[PDB]
C-alpha cells in the first residue's frame, strides 16, 4: 500500500501527465468493460506510440478533471511500482518477499484498489493466476497486437479474464488535433512557436508517406528534434559575427607578425592594419551588441514565459481546488494582463529578432527532414503536371532518339497520371513492339531515374522466366512457424530496395491466352489476384508490356518513312491476334524502331564512350572518323538481331585488334588517335 | 634525397600498391613486366599442344 505501492490519487493529483485530446471511443469502452462484474481486466490492443499510456494519462485527466462517470468515482486506485519493489533486495529472494507482501496488503484491501500495471506484459505467469481467479484484486492491462494474439487464446482462465478493446492510430485531422493539443508543452517547453500548417502538414504528410511509424510519434520526432534545433541554433552566435571573428583573429595574428621586427623601416607599416583593426572591432562589437539586444528580448520574454506557465497552471489549479477570491483574482486580474503584455512580447520578438529566428516554419522542417532522408528536395518541389509537360526535355537530356515514343508514351503518361483512363487501372497500359537492346532497359532506367529517382530500378519479365506456381510460395518462403526465420521472404530484399517496380513484360502475344486473362486482370482493376489468390495494388505500378512480333519490317521502316504507318499496320496484325478488349485496354500502340543513320552513329559512339573514358584514363584519345565507325556499323549491321552484333563487331572487329595494337606497343599513349581508313579490316595508325 | 639517393627511393607509387594486391589475391602479377604478347600471340599453338586443330574454336 505505502512503501511499494503508490496511490494514483496523488500521481494524477500531482499532475505528471501530458495533455490529451478527445479520446472518446477507447475510454468509454474502457468504462463499460470495467463495469462488467467479471473479465474487468481490459487489455488494449495496440503499441505505444498511439499513446496508450497517454490514454491512461487522460483517464487520469478525467479523474482529476472529474470527467469519469458515477461508476468509477470514489474508488481509491493504487498503482504497483516494481521499480520500487526491487528496493531492499540483497540476499537472493527478497524482491518476491516484498512482492508477496504486496499480495498480503492488496489481499486484505479486498477490492478497494484498482490496479494499473504500467507495461502489463511485465506481468512469470503461474502465480498471477490464483489471486485474480479467486477474485483478490482488480486490474487493467495493455499490450502489442502480436503479443496479444500470442497472449489470450490458449489458456482457459486466461481467455476467461483478459479482454479485447479496439484502440487504433487516427486519421489526418485527429492527429492534427493532437499536435494542437500538445503545442502547449511544445512551444512552452522548447523555446519555440508552432503554427497550424506545420501541424497539418506534419500529421498529413507523416500520415501519408510513412506507413511504418506512429502518429503523432514521428511528428513528435519532428517538433522535438527540430524545435530543439531552433532552440540550439538560437543559442549560437550569428553568421556575420563569426565571419568577422575569423577575420579579426587572423588580423590580430598578422599584427603580432608585424610587431616583432628586426628591420624597422620595413616593418613599421602597420598603421593602416591598426585602423582596419579598430574598424572591424567596432563592427563586431555592434553586431554582438545586437545579439545581446535579442537576448534582452529573450530575457524579458523568458521570465514572462516562466510567470506565464505559472499563471495558466495557477488558473487551472484555481479551477481545481477552489479558492473563491483567487479565482476571480486571476480571471479578472493577473492572467489577461499577462495576455496583453504577452502580445506586446510577441511584438517585442516581432521587432527585435532580426538575426535569430524564434519562430518555427516548414523550412527548418525541410532542414531536419532534408538531412533525415536524402531524397532530393527538388523532387518534392516538382509537381506532377510540370514533370508531365516538361518530360520530353529531361528525357532528351539522357536518352537520344525515340521521338514518337517519348511524345506518344508521354501522352499516355499525361493521360494516366492526369486520370484520363479508368482510375481502376495500373499506371501505364502499354504495348511495345520491336527488337531487344534498343533501350527498353535504358527507358526503364531513365523514367525510373526521373520520376522514381534510381539507376537501380527495373525488374523485367520475359514469359520464359516464369518462376512457377510454387514460386509464390518461394517468396513467402516457409509458412510461418517453420525454419527460415533468418531470411523468410526475399520479397523483403527485392522489395526492400524497390517498393514500386517498372516491369518490362516481354512478348505478351507469345504467351498463353491464360496470360491474356491473368494479364487482363493486370490491365483491369488495377490489381492482380496472383497464383496464391491474394492481390496487390498495381495502381502504383506501370505495366509496360513489350513484344517482338514484326522485327524485320520495323528494322527497315525507320529512316525517312513516317512511323504512324508502322504503328497502324502493326495494329492490323494486333487486331487479328488480340481480342478487341485488349485494344480497349491499352490507350495507344507504340512500336520501337532501330535508330537512323546518324543516330546509329550515335549508338556506336556511345558504345565507344566507354572506350573514350577507359582510354582517356590510360592516356589514349581516339578521334574516330565517321567512316571507320561506319565500317564498324556496316560490318556490324547484321539484319538478324539489329544492333546486337554491332557491339560484337565493334569490340571484336577493332577492339580486339585495338587491344593487340595498344597492348603490343604499336599505339603509344599520350597521342591523339584517329581511327583511319585503310582496307576493310581496320588498323589504328599513330 | 633527390640527388644522392640512388639505390633506395623513400617515396611511394601506385605500382607498389598493385603489386601488394597482386601478391594478395593470387592474380598473375606478370601481365605487365613479363612479355604478355609473346605468349598471347601463340595461345593458338599452346592450345595446339593438346587441343590441336579447331581454328574457329580458338
CA A292 to chain centre: 40
Distance CA A45, CA A33 (A): 14
Cis peptide before A216 (omega within 30 of 0): yes
Per the annotation, binding residues of A are 46-53, 434-441
- Which of B14, B31, B37, B56 best probes binding to A when mutated, by most A CB atoms within 10 angstroms? B37
Distance CA A337, CA A175 (A): 32
Distance CA A283, CA A75 (A): 68
Give me A358's grid cell.
Answer: 524564434
Q: Which residue is associated with the grid cell 527485392?
A: A494
* Residue A612 parent element (H or E): helix A609-618
Contact A632, A649 (CB under 8 A): yes
Distance CA A498, CA A526 (A): 19
Distance CA A667, CA A664 (A): 8
Distance from CA of B44 to the nearest CA of A (A): 15
Which residue from A46, A354, A69 is spatially nearest to A215, judged by alpha carbons? A46
Around A540, how many Cα atoms within 13 Å sit in the side-chain half-sphere?
Answer: 7
Beta strands in A387-480 (DSSP E): 432-433, 459-461
Contact A81, A116 (CB under 8 A): no
* Residue A328 parent element (H or E): helix A324-329
First to last CA, chain B: 52
Contact A55, A31 (CB under 8 A): no
38-57 in chain B: CB under 8 A from chain A: 41
Which residue from A187, A176, A298 is spatially nearest to A234, judged by alpha carbons? A298
> At B30, is the secondary structure helix, strand, or coil?
coil
> At A682, is the secondary structure helix, strand, or coil?
coil
Give me A517's grid cell.
Answer: 486473362
Nearest-10 Cα torsion for A221, A222, A225, A227? -140
* Residue A99 parent element (H or E): helix A95-109
φ, ψ of residue A171 to 5 degrees: the values are -80, -165
Q: Do B36 and A663 touch (CB under 8 A)?
A: yes
- Which of A658, A663, A667 best probes binding to B when mutated, by most B CB atoms within 10 angstroms? A663
Which residues in B lie closer than 8 A to residue A665 (C-beta atoms)? 37
Q: Do A660 and B36 touch (CB under 8 A)?
A: no
Which residue from A667, A656, A578 is spatially nearest to A620, judged by alpha carbons? A667
Q: Give the total residue count for chain B.
A: 58
For strands A542-547 and A432-433, give the pairing.
parallel
User: How does DSSP classify residue A279?
Assistant: H
Per the annotation, binding residues of A for ATP are 46-53, 434-441
**CB-count burial class (<10 Å; 0-12, 13-18, 19+) for A13:** middle
Which residues in A lie closer than 8 A to residue B36 (C-beta atoms)? 663
Cα Rg, chain A, nearest whole Å? 37
Distance CA A103, CA A98 (A): 9
> At A535, is the secondary structure helix, strand, or coil?
strand
Q: Give the residue from chain A lying closest to B31, CA to CA.
A: A663
Give me A294's grid cell.
Answer: 535579442
Contact A238, A355 (CB under 8 A): yes
* Residue A126 parent element (H or E): none
Q: Give the residue from chain A lying closest to B40, CA to CA.
A: A660
**CB-count burial class (<10 Å; 0-12, 13-18, 19+) for A187:** middle
For strands A621-622 and A502-505, give the pairing.
unpaired
Contact A288, A241 (CB under 8 A): yes
Contact A43, A163 (CB under 8 A): yes
Q: Enumerate residues 6+ apart whose C-beta is below 8 A from A101.
A: A4
> At A115, is the secondary structure helix, strand, or coil?
strand
- Count CB pairs under 8 A between chains A and B: 6
Distance from CA of A664 to the nearest CA of B (A): 6
For the beta carbon of residue A63, count every other beta carbon within 10 angstroms: 18
Contact A338, A311 (CB under 8 A): yes
Q: Enumerate residues 6+ apart whose C-beta is below 8 A from A442.
A: A399
- Say yes or no: A664 contacts chain B, CB-CB below 8 A: yes
Kindly provide the resolution of this structure in angstroms, with one decimal.
Answer: 4.5
* Residue A166 parent element (H or E): strand A162-166
Amino acid at each position: 500500500l505505502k512503501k511499494y505501492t503508490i496511490d494514483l490519487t496523488e500521481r494524477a493529483e500531482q499532475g505528471k501527465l501530458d495533455p490529451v485530446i478527445g479520446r472518446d471511443e477507447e475510454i468509454r469502452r474502457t468504462i463499460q468493460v470495467l463495469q462488467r462484474r467479471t473479465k474487468n481486466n481490459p487489455v488494449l490492443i495496440g503499441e505505444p506510440g498511439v499513446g496508450k499510456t497517454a490514454i491512461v494519462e487522460g483517464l487520469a485527466q478525467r479523474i482529476i478533471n472529474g470527467e469519469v462517470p458515477e461508476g468509477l468515482k470514489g474508488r481509491r486506485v493504487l498503482a504497483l511500482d516494481m521499480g520500487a519493489l526491487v528496493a531492499g533486495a540483497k540476499y537472493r529472494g527478497e524482491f518476491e518477499e516484498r512482492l508477496k507482501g504486496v499480495l498480503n496488503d492488496l489481499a486484505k484491501q479486498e477490492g478497494n484498489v484498482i490496479l494499473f500495471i504500467d507495461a502489463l506484459h511485465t506481468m512469470a505467469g503461474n502465480m498471477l493466476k490464483p489471486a485474480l481467479a479467486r477474485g483478490e484484486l482488480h486490474c487493467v492491462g495493455a499490450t502489442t497486437l502480436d503479443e496479444y494474439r500470442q497472449y489470450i487464446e490458449k489458456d482457459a482462465a486466461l481467455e476467461r479474464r483478459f479482454q479485447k478493446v479496439f484502440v487504433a492510430e487516427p486519421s489526418v485531422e485527429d492527429t492534427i488535433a493532437i499536435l494542437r493539443g500538445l503545442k502547449e508543452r511544445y512551444e512552452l517547453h522548447h523555446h519555440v512557436q508552432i503554427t497550424d500548417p506545420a501541424i497539418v502538414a506534419a500529421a498529413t504528410l507523416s500520415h501519408r508517406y510513412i506507413a511504418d511509424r506512429q502518429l503523432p510519434d514521428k511528428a513528435i520526432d519532428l517538433i522535438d528534434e527540430a524545435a530543439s534545433s531552433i532552440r540550439m541554433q538560437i543559442d549560437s552566435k550569428p553568421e556575420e559575427l563569426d565571419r568577422l571573428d575569423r577575420r579579426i583573429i587572423q588580423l590580430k595574428l598578422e599584427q603580432q607578425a608585424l610587431m616583432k621586427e628586426s628591420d624597422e623601416a620595413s616593418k613599421k607599416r602597420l598603421d593602416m592594419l591598426n585602423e582596419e583593426l579598430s574598424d572591424k572591432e567596432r563592427q563586431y562589437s555592434e553586431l554582438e551588441e545586437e545579439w545581446k539586444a535579442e537576448k534582452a528580448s529573450l530575457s524579458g520574454t523568458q521570465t514572462i514565459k516562466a510567470e506565464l506557465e505559472q499563471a495558466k497552471i495557477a488558473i487551472e489549479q484555481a479551477r481545481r481546488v477552489g479558492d473563491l477570491a483567487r479565482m476571480s483574482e486571476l480571471q479578472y486580474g493577473k492572467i489577461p494582463e499577462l495576455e496583453k503584455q504577452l502580445e506586446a512580447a510577441t511584438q517585442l520578438e516581432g521587432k527585435t529578432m532580426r538575426l535569430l529566428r524564434n519562430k518555427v516554419t516548414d523550412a527548418e522542417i525541410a532542414e531536419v527532414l532534408a538531412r533525415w532522408t536524402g531524397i532530393p528536395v527538388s523532387r518534392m518541389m516538382e509537381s506532377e503536371r510540370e514533370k508531365l509537360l516538361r518530360m520530353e526535355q529531361e528525357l532528351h537530356h539522357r536518352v537520344i532518339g525515340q521521338n514518337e515514343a517519348v511524345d506518344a508514351v508521354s501522352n499516355a503518361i499525361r493521360r494516366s497520371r492526369a486520370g484520363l483512363a479508368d482510375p481502376n487501372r495500373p499506371i501505364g497500359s502499354f504495348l511495345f513492339l520491336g527488337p531487344t537492346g534498343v533501350g527498353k532497359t535504358e527507358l526503364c532506367k531513365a523514367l525510373a531515374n526521373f520520376m522514381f529517382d534510381s539507376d537501380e530500378a527495373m525488374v523485367r519479365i520475359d514469359m520464359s522466366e516464369f518462376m512457377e506456381k510454387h514460386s509464390v510460395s518461394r517468396l513467402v518462403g516457409a509458412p510461418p512457424g517453420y525454419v527460415g526465420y533468418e531470411e523468410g521472404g526475399y520479397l523483403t530484399e527485392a522489395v526492400r530496395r524497390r517498393p514500386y517496380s517498372v516491369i518490362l513484360l516481354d512478348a505478351v502475344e507469345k504467351a498463353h491466352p491464360d496470360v491474356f486473362n491473368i494479364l487482363l486482370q493486370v490491365l483491369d482493376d488495377g490489381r492482380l489476384t496472383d497464383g496464391q489468390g491474394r492481390t496487390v495494388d498495381f495502381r502504383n505500378t506501370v505495366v509496360i508490356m513489350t513484344s517482338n512480333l514484326g522485327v524485320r519490317e520495323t528494322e527497315r521502316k525507320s529512316i525517312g518513312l513516317i512511323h504512324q504507318d508502322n504503328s497502324t499496320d502493326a495494329m492490323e496484325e494486333i487486331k487479328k491476334i488480340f481480342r478487341p478488349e485488349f485494344i480497349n485496354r491499352i490507350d495507344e500502340v507504340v512500336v520501337f524502331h532501330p535508330l537512323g543513320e546518324q543516330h546509329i552513329a550515335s549508338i556506336a559512339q556511345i558504345q565507344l564512350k566507354r572506350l573514350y573514358k577507359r582510354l582517356e584514363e590510360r592516356g589514349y584519345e581516339i578521334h574516330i572518323s565517321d567512316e571507320a565507325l561506319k565500317l564498324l556499323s556496316e560490318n556490324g549491321y547484321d539484319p538478324v538481331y539489329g544492333a546486337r552484333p554491332l557491339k560484337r563487331a565493334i569490340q571484336q572487329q577493332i577492339e580486339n585488334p585495338l587491344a593487340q595494337q595498344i597492348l603490343s606497343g604499336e599505339l603509344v599513349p599520350g597521342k591523339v588517335i584517329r581511327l583511319e581508313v585503310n582496307e576493310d579490316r581496320i588498323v589504328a595508325v599513330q
